[PDB]
Design an enzyme around this catalytic site. Structure first.
Site, PDB file in Angstrom:
ATOM      1  N   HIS A   1      50.672  34.976  47.122  1.00 48.54           N
ATOM      2  CA  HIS A   1      50.790  35.557  48.532  1.00 48.54           C
ATOM      3  C   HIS A   1      51.238  34.925  49.438  1.00 48.54           C
ATOM      4  O   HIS A   1      50.966  35.183  50.659  1.00 48.54           O
ATOM      5  CB  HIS A   1      49.121  36.272  48.751  1.00 48.54           C
ATOM      6  CG  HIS A   1      48.219  35.353  48.529  1.00 48.54           C
ATOM      7  ND1 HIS A   1      48.050  34.299  49.740  1.00 48.54           N
ATOM      8  CD2 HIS A   1      46.924  35.163  48.061  1.00 48.54           C
ATOM      9  CE1 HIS A   1      47.181  33.731  49.398  1.00 48.54           C
ATOM     10  NE2 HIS A   1      46.244  34.108  48.348  1.00 48.54           N
TER      11      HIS A   1
ATOM     12  N   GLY B   1      42.475  28.774  54.734  1.00 44.96           N
ATOM     13  CA  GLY B   1      43.381  27.758  54.342  1.00 44.96           C
ATOM     14  C   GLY B   1      43.101  27.209  52.897  1.00 44.96           C
ATOM     15  O   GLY B   1      43.913  26.185  52.591  1.00 44.96           O
TER      16      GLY B   1
ATOM     17  N   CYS C   1      43.293  28.662  49.910  1.00 43.21           N
ATOM     18  CA  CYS C   1      44.096  29.222  48.763  1.00 43.21           C
ATOM     19  C   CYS C   1      45.167  28.192  48.136  1.00 43.21           C
ATOM     20  O   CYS C   1      45.438  27.414  48.647  1.00 43.21           O
ATOM     21  CB  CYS C   1      44.857  30.424  49.288  1.00 43.21           C
ATOM     22  SG  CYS C   1      43.922  31.702  49.912  1.00 43.21           S
TER      23      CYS C   1
HETATM   24  O1  LIG Z   1      42.601  31.273  53.380  1.00 43.20           O
HETATM   25  C1  LIG Z   1      42.174  32.607  52.957  1.00 43.20           C
HETATM   26  C2  LIG Z   1      40.742  32.539  52.709  1.00 43.20           C
HETATM   27  C3  LIG Z   1      40.313  32.099  51.346  1.00 43.20           C
HETATM   28  N1  LIG Z   1      38.982  31.948  50.955  1.00 43.20           N
HETATM   29  C4  LIG Z   1      38.103  32.172  51.715  1.00 43.20           C
HETATM   30  C5  LIG Z   1      38.351  32.447  52.986  1.00 43.20           C
HETATM   31 CL1  LIG Z   1      37.165  32.842  54.203  1.00 43.20          CL
HETATM   32  C6  LIG Z   1      39.612  32.767  53.663  1.00 43.20           C
HETATM   33  N2  LIG Z   1      42.953  33.628  53.049  1.00 43.20           N
HETATM   34  C7  LIG Z   1      44.112  33.589  53.813  1.00 43.20           C
HETATM   35  C8  LIG Z   1      44.828  34.723  53.769  1.00 43.20           C
HETATM   36  C9  LIG Z   1      45.336  35.364  52.332  1.00 43.20           C
HETATM   37  N3  LIG Z   1      44.269  36.331  51.828  1.00 43.20           N
HETATM   38  C10 LIG Z   1      44.812  36.929  50.494  1.00 43.20           C
HETATM   39  C11 LIG Z   1      44.003  38.082  50.034  1.00 43.20           C
HETATM   40  C12 LIG Z   1      43.310  38.812  51.096  1.00 43.20           C
HETATM   41  C13 LIG Z   1      42.517  39.827  50.542  1.00 43.20           C
HETATM   42  C14 LIG Z   1      42.887  40.378  49.296  1.00 43.20           C
HETATM   43  C15 LIG Z   1      43.444  39.676  48.330  1.00 43.20           C
HETATM   44  C16 LIG Z   1      44.091  38.630  48.795  1.00 43.20           C
HETATM   45 CL2  LIG Z   1      45.181  37.740  47.488  1.00 43.20          CL
HETATM   46  C17 LIG Z   1      42.964  35.306  51.642  1.00 43.20           C
HETATM   47  C18 LIG Z   1      42.491  34.840  52.692  1.00 43.20           C
END
Ligand SMILES: O=C(c1cncc(Cl)c1)N1CCCN(Cc2ccccc2Cl)CC1
Ligand SMILES: O=C(c1cncc(Cl)c1)N1CCCN(Cc2ccccc2Cl)CC1
Ligand SMILES: [Br-]
Ligand SMILES: [Br-]
Ligand SMILES: [Cl-]
Ligand SMILES: [Cl-]
Ligand code: NA
Lengths: 306, 304
Positions: free
Chosen positions: A41, A143, A145
């Site tokens: 992603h 941030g 991921c």
């Molecule tokens: O950095 C984070 C994050 C990670 N972990 C916790 C939090 Cl609070 C934010 N992101 C950043 C944008 C990317 N999306 C990807 C995605 C969202 C929803 C369905 C599937 C997918 Cl793969 C994830 C969110």
């Protein structure tokens, strides 16, 4: 004595964390040998997330659309490919700090350490378990991921999780290092939700064995149970079924303490019925389920405090 | 989202762990530049531990009495001395992996990460707090002496604890890296006990702020209190007094959530007086006190 959520020392993994940027998106990658692994992603915009076609998004990228930074050094990307939901960026430099490693896909109930990272830099380490509903209860912010989960039994790092997203209930979903999600989750903004979770029975039993090794028996009783009657009761408290494989895995803890597995099952049935009555077990007022039998053997003394 | 007991990444400290042997005793040491630091009790036999005269036992030792192993490499000892309860072994090789560091002595209530080691090899990492009674609830077995506790700030490791012993209740005691004990403990096999402990009130308030940040708000209420009225309740429940400095340290969490510290104190007062009524906070049925206000900010803001 003591009993803590104990992670593996993280240094072997810290030396593999890098930052990956594609356009305006930055996340973490894992640099092993000459390959950097990261969530695919990284090639999406926020708009692409509802219905991304990753093959079409990726064909439009060149190697030089990916920027990889290891500390203060830029690594040059010389190839890229997608494997399931992970992107593999071939770089011109092999990581000189690559530890001995392997990739392992784990089962629900297994634990691992997570090295939470932001911008390629490690922030902290903690233990997690793969829940029965294929989510993890982590601590991750925007941030994070690309942060990974691993174990380091016997000097080999076994990588088992890469973080991809947070679900609406605040729990986390991700993949193994071959890019296959744990659970039915997808890297798309769908209405996916964590299914109802259950408690990891075999781990609660392992933790009660830890409490006996460390000197406490107040919760035992004079009863036993059959495996089927224990499962019929446990399932009423949303506990996972205990299988003969779980009974076998608890064998060494049963031998060290002299408490038969089905007799510890009878103690758990009574703790579910009664609660603690103001007592604690290993410092907890609730039954803990994120230590496996292997984790207890790893941390506890091999001599019971009788 | 999420809130876990999180340790600092331990790599910078792993590269400093070595094994120190004196006669039949082996334990861990910390190798920084050309000095290895370890508990002075490494020079004692089991019989010497009953009433050790460390100056006399050390005067009987020379450099050759100490064997230091860093992985598969033997480091030659070229000098030795004691600083309080720590032995300092000067070695012929400077650690090429020495991080930027300081030795810092912490106060009760502060947290730190522990890198548990055995035979000079790191085994695990976890987070601890220095209790008000100066013990730590660690997880240590035979062979763990010399394991260290630390915090990190940017690239600087602040070492704050070296493990020396376990008390009868299964909790642990040790020193700062200058060899000064935390708590009224001595490195002698004599009768010793952890004193009655208390709960770290400022940390429980920090954790209630972490719960609000993570969406757990059921314990909020319309009431406020005063510092004096709250402290009368803290004393009754074996909680440490809350000072104006604690109210000030909670300033950033109070600003992030918009909840005044005395408003959160009224929530804590009601939890102490009534219990949780079958509910949990951040998955716990106990009021957690091993997160400082800085730990909450660190984890809820993603500091690296
Ligand atoms: O950095 C984070 C994050 C990670 N972990 C916790 C939090 Cl609070 C934010 N992101 C950043 C944008 C990317 N999306 C990807 C995605 C969202 C929803 C369905 C599937 C997918 Cl793969 C994830 C969110
Ligand atoms: O390895 C450990 C250990 C550490 N932590 C936990 C456990 Cl279960 C064992 N030892 C090893 C022998 C040394 N003594 C020293 C000593 C004992 C009693 C009073 C004061 C002192 Cl300083 C400490 C015990
Ligand atoms: Br009021
Ligand atoms: Br609890
Ligand atoms: Cl813990
Ligand atoms: Cl393995
Ligand atoms: Na209030």
């Amino acid at each position: 004595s003591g009993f803590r959520k104990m992670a593996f020392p993280s240094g072997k993994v810290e030396g593999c964390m890098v930052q990956v940027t594609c356009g305006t998106t930055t996340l973490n990658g894992l640099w092993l040998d000459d390959v950097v692994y990261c969530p695919r992603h990284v090639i999406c915009t926020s708009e692409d997330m509802l219905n991304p076609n990753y093959e079409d998004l990726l064909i439009r990228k060149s190697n030089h659309n990916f920027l990889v930074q290891a500390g203060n050094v830029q690594l040059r990307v010389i190839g890229h490919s997608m494997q399931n939901c992970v992107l593999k960026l071939k770089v011109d430099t092999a990581n000189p700090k690559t530890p001995k490693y392997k990739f392992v896909r784990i089962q629900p109930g297994q634990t691992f350490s997570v090295l939470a990272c932001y911008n390629g830099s490690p922030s902290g380490v903690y233990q997690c378990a793969m829940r029965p509903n294929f989510t993890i209860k982590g601590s991750f912010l925007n941030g994070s991921c690309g942060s990974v989960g691993f174990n380091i039994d016997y000097d080999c790092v076994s990588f088992c999780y890469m973080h991809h997203m947070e679900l609406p209930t605040g729990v986390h979903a991700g993949t193994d290092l071959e890019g296959n999600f744990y659970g039915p989750f997808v890297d798309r903004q769908t209405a996916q939700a964590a299914g109802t979770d259950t408690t990891i029975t075999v781990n609660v039993l392992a933790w009660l064995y830890a409490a006996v090794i460390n000197g406490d028996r107040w919760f035992l009783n004079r009863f036993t149970t059959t495996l089927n009657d224990f499962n019929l009761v446990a399932m009423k408290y949303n506990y996972e079924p205990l299988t003969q494989d779980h009974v076998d895995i608890l064998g060494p803890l049963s031998a060290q303490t002299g408490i038969a597995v089905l007799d510890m099952c009878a103690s758990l049935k009574e703790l579910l019925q009664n609660g603690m009555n103001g007592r604690t077990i290993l410092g907890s007022a609730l039954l803990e389920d994120e230590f496996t039998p292997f984790d207890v053997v790893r941390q506890c003394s091999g001599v019971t405090f009788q």
